[PDB]
């Protein structure tokens, strides 16, 4: 289906972002990385008090927290491209807290964070993204 290809596109964006965050060596993706990184930096400083007290011990606990935060962020019924950027900024925050405190480090299984991020974006914001220009004409033209 079209949703399969749409899912893979978003998954690649989320993977790229995580590789950018960890500095592990496309246009839309580069634009996303630039804006999400400055979102993430601001968020990490505004939330030091909160975040210093958050344990991200596994991919499972990262997922639970991601899902709870996503539910609260979007419960007012508003989707926009700026909020979509914050999903990526937040996954970047989860990936840092995870490997900061992960006891047996595993970078490959961070595919898994990218996957549940893509699942959220696709199932909850995917139809909005389509009605709002897609990544290539909605997102890029706005944030480039």
């Amino acid at each position: 289906s079209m949703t399969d290809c749409e899912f893979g596109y978003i998954y690649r964006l989320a993977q790229d972002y995580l590789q950018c965050v960890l500095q592990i060596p496309s246009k839309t993706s580069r634009v996303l990385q630039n804006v999400a990184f400055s979102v993430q930096k601001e968020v990490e400083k505004n939330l030091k008090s909160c975040l210093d007290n958050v344990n991200v011990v596994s991919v499972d606990t990262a997922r639970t927290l991601f899902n709870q935060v996503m539910e609260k962020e979007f419960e007012d019924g508003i989707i926009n491209w700026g909020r979509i950027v914050t999903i990526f900024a937040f996954e970047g925050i989860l990936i840092k807290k995870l490997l900061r405190q992960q006891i047996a480090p595993d970078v490959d299984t961070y595919k898994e964070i990218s996957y549940f991020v893509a699942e959220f974006i696709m199932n909850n914001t995917g139809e909005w993204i389509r009605q709002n220009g897609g990544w290539e004409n909605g997102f890029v033209k706005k944030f480039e």
């Binding site: 007290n53 539910e71 609260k72 926009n80 700026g82």
Partner: peptide, 25 residues
């Protein structure tokens, strides 16, 4: 107890909406 879901969601929502206003086209 602390509800980090609320503290984080609140900040992401705020900055998401600001950034939404700061970029256009």
């Amino acid at each position: 107890d602390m509800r980090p879901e609320i503290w984080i969601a609140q900040e992401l929502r705020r900055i998401g909406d600001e950034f939404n206003a700061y970029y256009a086209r």
